Amino acid sequence: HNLALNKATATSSIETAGHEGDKAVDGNAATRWASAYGASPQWIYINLGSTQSISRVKLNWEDAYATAYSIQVSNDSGSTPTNWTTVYSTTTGDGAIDDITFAATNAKFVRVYATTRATAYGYSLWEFEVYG
Numbered sequence: 001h002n003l004a005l006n007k008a009t010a011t012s013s014i015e016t017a018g019h020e021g022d023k024a025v026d027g028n029a030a031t032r033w034a035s036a037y038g039a040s041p042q043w044i045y046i047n048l049g050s051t052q053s054i055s056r057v058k059l060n061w062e063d064a065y066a067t068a069y070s071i072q073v074s075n076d077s078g079s080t081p082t083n084w085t086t087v088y089s090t091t092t093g094d095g096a097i098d099d100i101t102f103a104a105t106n107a108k109f110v111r112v113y114a115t116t117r118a119t120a121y122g123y124s125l126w127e128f129e130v131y132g
């Protein structure tokens with residue numbers, strides 16, 4: 001059960017209309033979030049809507065994937081998280097599907113914080129799935 005499905009999202013940026021964060025959590029492999037281009041970090045987070053115990057994230061990257069990124073959680077109250085905790089990071093991402101597991105943790109928000117690009121574009125996810 002994908003706890004991210006159709007939850008509210010926010011992003012650091014978007015490439016164009018139609019590439020919003022909601023596109024990464026629609027369960028559709030043919031729609032994607034895509035960030036602005038360039039060498040800045042970028043990110044997408046999901047408001048899970050309630051505290052959930054999570055242990056697994058599945059990323060389905062488009063060709064503009066991150067070689068370096070972290071998965072982070074927040075347990076802030078409200079709808080605007082500001083404190084993040086890294087639960088997993090890599091510097092050797094290889095794109096396509098990334099199936100990530102980590103110690104189960106409470107989380108109200110989950111963020112992909114992407115820091116090194118595989119390409120000279122931005123970063124883009126067809127899907128960002130979250131599992132207990």
Ligand SMILES: N[C@@H]1[C@@H](O)[C@H](O[C@@H]2O[C@H](CO)[C@@H](O[C@@H]3O[C@H](CO)[C@@H](O)[C@H](O)[C@H]3N)[C@H](O)[C@H]2N)[C@@H](CO)O[C@H]1O
Nearest residue numbers: 015019033034035037062063064065119121122123124
């Ligand atoms: N100089 C143009 C060249 O830019 C163009 O190639 C296309 O450029 C597209 C716009 O950057 C690029 O689309 C991005 O692709 C990445 C990676 O797949 C995605 O994450 C972005 O969302 C896309 N906007 C295309 O890949 C690329 N074909 C070419 C064709 O118009 O004309 C060149 O000479």
